[PDB]
Amino acid sequence: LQCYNCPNPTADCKTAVNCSSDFDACLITKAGLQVYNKCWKFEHCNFNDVTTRLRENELTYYCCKKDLCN
């Protein structure tokens, strides 16, 4: 379960890493332009529950749950 993402608001970075254990729902947030991509708890990709702790509102996040999914 890896993840093609970057910790801070990175528009030019999605290094591949692995952070699941209890959260393999790899969320990719796309707020305005900065994508808040981080790892997530499978049982939390409802609506804004993903970018809730990562700034929520009317974004367009895509959370995969299989592997880097990128």
Swiss-Prot record:
Mutagenesis / variant outcome for changing E56R: Almost complete loss of function. Lysis
Annotated consequence of substituting R53E: Loss of function. Lysis
A GO term from the CC aspect: vesicle
Disulphide bond pairs: C3-C26, C6-C13, C19-C39, C45-C63, C64-C69
Domain UPAR/Ly6: 1-70
Keywords, alphabetical: Cell membrane, Disease variant, Disulfide bond, Glycation, Glycoprotein, GPI-anchor, Hereditary hemolytic anemia, Lipoprotein, Membrane, Secreted, Signal
Name of protein: CD59 glycoprotein
Source species: Homo sapiens (Human)
Gene: CD59
Full-protein interval shown: 26 to 95 of 128
